[PDB]
Design a protein around this motif. Structure first.
Motif, PDB file in Angstrom:
ATOM      1  N   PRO A 163     -29.525  79.219 -94.573  1.00 49.26           N
ATOM      2  CA  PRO A 163     -30.101  78.152 -95.403  1.00 49.26           C
ATOM      3  C   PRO A 163     -29.927  76.742 -94.847  1.00 49.26           C
ATOM      4  O   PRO A 163     -30.550  75.812 -95.378  1.00 49.26           O
ATOM      5  N   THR A 164     -29.108  76.552 -93.814  1.00 55.04           N
ATOM      6  CA  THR A 164     -28.754  75.236 -93.296  1.00 55.04           C
ATOM      7  C   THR A 164     -28.791  75.261 -91.776  1.00 55.04           C
ATOM      8  O   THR A 164     -28.722  76.328 -91.146  1.00 55.04           O
ATOM      9  N   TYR A 165     -28.844  74.060 -91.184  1.00 55.31           N
ATOM     10  CA  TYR A 165     -28.802  73.961 -89.729  1.00 55.31           C
ATOM     11  C   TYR A 165     -27.493  74.533 -89.173  1.00 55.31           C
ATOM     12  O   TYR A 165     -27.496  75.265 -88.176  1.00 55.31           O
ATOM     13  N   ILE A 166     -26.369  74.234 -89.809  1.00 53.52           N
ATOM     14  CA  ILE A 166     -25.104  74.808 -89.343  1.00 53.52           C
ATOM     15  C   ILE A 166     -25.154  76.332 -89.394  1.00 53.52           C
ATOM     16  O   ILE A 166     -24.710  77.005 -88.464  1.00 53.52           O
ATOM     17  N   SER A 167     -25.703  76.903 -90.468  1.00 55.75           N
ATOM     18  CA  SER A 167     -25.779  78.363 -90.539  1.00 55.75           C
ATOM     19  C   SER A 167     -26.705  78.917 -89.459  1.00 55.75           C
ATOM     20  O   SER A 167     -26.500  80.036 -88.971  1.00 55.75           O
ATOM     21  N   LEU A 168     -27.696  78.129 -89.038  1.00 61.64           N
ATOM     22  CA  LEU A 168     -28.624  78.581 -88.010  1.00 61.64           C
ATOM     23  C   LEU A 168     -27.937  78.683 -86.656  1.00 61.64           C
ATOM     24  O   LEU A 168     -28.123  79.664 -85.929  1.00 61.64           O
ATOM     25  N   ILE A 169     -27.194  77.649 -86.268  1.00 57.80           N
ATOM     26  CA  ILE A 169     -26.458  77.702 -85.007  1.00 57.80           C
ATOM     27  C   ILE A 169     -25.438  78.845 -85.027  1.00 57.80           C
ATOM     28  O   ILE A 169     -25.314  79.623 -84.067  1.00 57.80           O
ATOM     29  N   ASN A 170     -24.671  78.933 -86.106  1.00 58.48           N
ATOM     30  CA  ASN A 170     -23.601  79.922 -86.198  1.00 58.48           C
ATOM     31  C   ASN A 170     -24.153  81.341 -86.169  1.00 58.48           C
ATOM     32  O   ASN A 170     -23.627  82.222 -85.474  1.00 58.48           O
ATOM     33  N   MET A 171     -25.203  81.591 -86.945  1.00 56.03           N
ATOM     34  CA  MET A 171     -25.715  82.953 -87.015  1.00 56.03           C
ATOM     35  C   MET A 171     -26.383  83.348 -85.708  1.00 56.03           C
ATOM     36  O   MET A 171     -26.287  84.511 -85.285  1.00 56.03           O
ATOM     37  N   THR A 172     -27.031  82.392 -85.029  1.00 64.39           N
ATOM     38  CA  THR A 172     -27.686  82.706 -83.767  1.00 64.39           C
ATOM     39  C   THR A 172     -26.657  83.078 -82.703  1.00 64.39           C
ATOM     40  O   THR A 172     -26.821  84.071 -81.987  1.00 64.39           O
ATOM     41  N   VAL A 173     -25.560  82.328 -82.622  1.00 67.57           N
ATOM     42  CA  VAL A 173     -24.518  82.658 -81.655  1.00 67.57           C
ATOM     43  C   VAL A 173     -23.818  83.954 -82.051  1.00 67.57           C
ATOM     44  O   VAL A 173     -23.507  84.798 -81.198  1.00 67.57           O
ATOM     45  N   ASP A 174     -23.574  84.138 -83.351  1.00 68.88           N
ATOM     46  CA  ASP A 174     -22.937  85.359 -83.830  1.00 68.88           C
ATOM     47  C   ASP A 174     -23.784  86.587 -83.519  1.00 68.88           C
ATOM     48  O   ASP A 174     -23.250  87.639 -83.144  1.00 68.88           O
ATOM     49  N   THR A 175     -25.110  86.472 -83.662  1.00 69.03           N
ATOM     50  CA  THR A 175     -25.988  87.614 -83.404  1.00 69.03           C
ATOM     51  C   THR A 175     -26.079  87.916 -81.913  1.00 69.03           C
ATOM     52  O   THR A 175     -26.145  89.089 -81.514  1.00 69.03           O
ATOM     53  N   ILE A 176     -26.113  86.873 -81.078  1.00 72.46           N
ATOM     54  CA  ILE A 176     -26.013  87.070 -79.636  1.00 72.46           C
ATOM     55  C   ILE A 176     -24.727  87.816 -79.310  1.00 72.46           C
ATOM     56  O   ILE A 176     -24.736  88.820 -78.590  1.00 72.46           O
ATOM     57  N   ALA A 177     -23.603  87.342 -79.864  1.00 73.54           N
ATOM     58  CA  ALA A 177     -22.294  87.870 -79.494  1.00 73.54           C
ATOM     59  C   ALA A 177     -22.155  89.334 -79.881  1.00 73.54           C
ATOM     60  O   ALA A 177     -21.583  90.128 -79.128  1.00 73.54           O
ATOM     61  N   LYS A 178     -22.666  89.711 -81.054  1.00 76.29           N
ATOM     62  CA  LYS A 178     -22.551  91.106 -81.468  1.00 76.29           C
ATOM     63  C   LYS A 178     -23.467  92.007 -80.647  1.00 76.29           C
ATOM     64  O   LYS A 178     -23.162  93.192 -80.465  1.00 76.29           O
ATOM     65  N   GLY A 179     -24.566  91.465 -80.116  1.00 77.51           N
ATOM     66  CA  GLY A 179     -25.400  92.248 -79.219  1.00 77.51           C
ATOM     67  C   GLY A 179     -24.675  92.664 -77.953  1.00 77.51           C
ATOM     68  O   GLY A 179     -24.992  93.702 -77.361  1.00 77.51           O
ATOM     69  N   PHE A 180     -23.710  91.863 -77.513  1.00 80.72           N
ATOM     70  CA  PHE A 180     -22.837  92.243 -76.411  1.00 80.72           C
ATOM     71  C   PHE A 180     -21.531  92.837 -76.946  1.00 80.72           C
ATOM     72  O   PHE A 180     -21.306  94.047 -76.880  1.00 80.72           O
TER      73      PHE A 180
END
Ligand SMILES: [Zn+2]
Ligand SMILES: [Zn+2]
Length: 272
Positions: free
Chosen positions: A255-272
């Motif tokens: 819902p927020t810009y902070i959540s966008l950065i965090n979730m994008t990095v988190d989703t990258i990280a879990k893919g590895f």
């Protein structure tokens, strides 16, 4: 506390950053809705009226909004401000837009501090009666953005450098990838009606094998089918959806810009 100072932004990322700076002294609205494709958005008559009702209009520039300049010609007596002023562009590397600015500068949190400052300045200039609320809110919000660097880098620290390959659909992550030392690969360099649909798909399919890239992603405003195809033709997991061009709805995961950065990095990280 009359009818509040009104800000209209082109898309949702700017809306959320600006609303954090505005607090409760101004109302910030986005022309595009959560989930909508922003590069080639087609403005409507109701969009003209909305922007015309604003006291200030904020847009990204770096030709992100291909529609804005022609759209803005219909708006009278409303100042606009480019919120990427002073950011050094990374150029687009391939395709029909090779050499144009990569507009996705907000995916670097250090660049977001420059967004914040351009927005603070515009608010203070055109709504001077609330300069102290804007200045206070901007400094507080800038501190929240700076505090992301350590947890973000730590979240990605299990991936050795040679394996830091970020394979997405739109090449929308160049600024994030530069900040955190990833090599980017993408199915198309910038959103657009364009040729190169399957030829990049198999060039990407090739890059996956020499480097045994384990995961590929898509993004929330475009189609996941090319990324999913690339995952089947390789041994790579489909890891997406990543968020870059839009927030989610208020009740959704981003819902927020902070959540966008965090979730994008988190989703990258879990893919590895
Ligand atoms: Zn101005
Ligand atoms: Zn994009």
């Amino acid at each position: 506390t009359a009818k509040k100072f009104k800000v209209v932004t082109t898309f949702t990322i700017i809306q959320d950053i600006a609303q954090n700076i505005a607090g409760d002294v101004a109302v910030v609205e986005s022309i595009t809705k959560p989930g909508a494709e922003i590069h080639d958005y087609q403005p409507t008559p109701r969009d003209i009226v909305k922007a015309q009702s604003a006291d200030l209009i904020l847009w990204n520039g770096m030709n992100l909004e291909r529609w804005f300049e022609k759209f803005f010609e219909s708006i009278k007596d409303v100042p606009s401000a480019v919120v990427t002023a002073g950011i050094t562009p990374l150029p687009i590397r391939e395709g029909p837009y090779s050499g144009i600015a990569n507009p996705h500068a907000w995916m670097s949190p250090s660049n977001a501090l420059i967004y914040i400052e351009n927005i603070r300045k515009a608010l203070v200039e055109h709504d001077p009666a609330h300069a102290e609320t804007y200045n206070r809110n901007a400094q507080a919000y800038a501190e929240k953005i700076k505090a992301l660097d350590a947890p973000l880098r730590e979240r990605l620290s299990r991936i050795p450098a040679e394996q830091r390959w970020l394979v997405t659909s739109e090449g929308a992550f160049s600024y994030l990838a530069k900040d955190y030392g990833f090599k980017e690969v993408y199915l198309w360099p910038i959103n657009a009606e364009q040729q190169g649909i399957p030829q990049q798909v198999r060039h990407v399919i090739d890059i996956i094998r020499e480097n045994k890239i384990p995961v590929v992603f898509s993004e929330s405003t475009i189609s996941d089918k090319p990324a999913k195809q690339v995952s089947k033709e390789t041994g790579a997991q489909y890891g997406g959806v990543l968020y870059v061009d839009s927030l989610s709805g208020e009740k959704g995961p981003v819902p927020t810009y902070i959540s966008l950065i965090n979730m994008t990095v988190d989703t990258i990280a879990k893919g590895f």
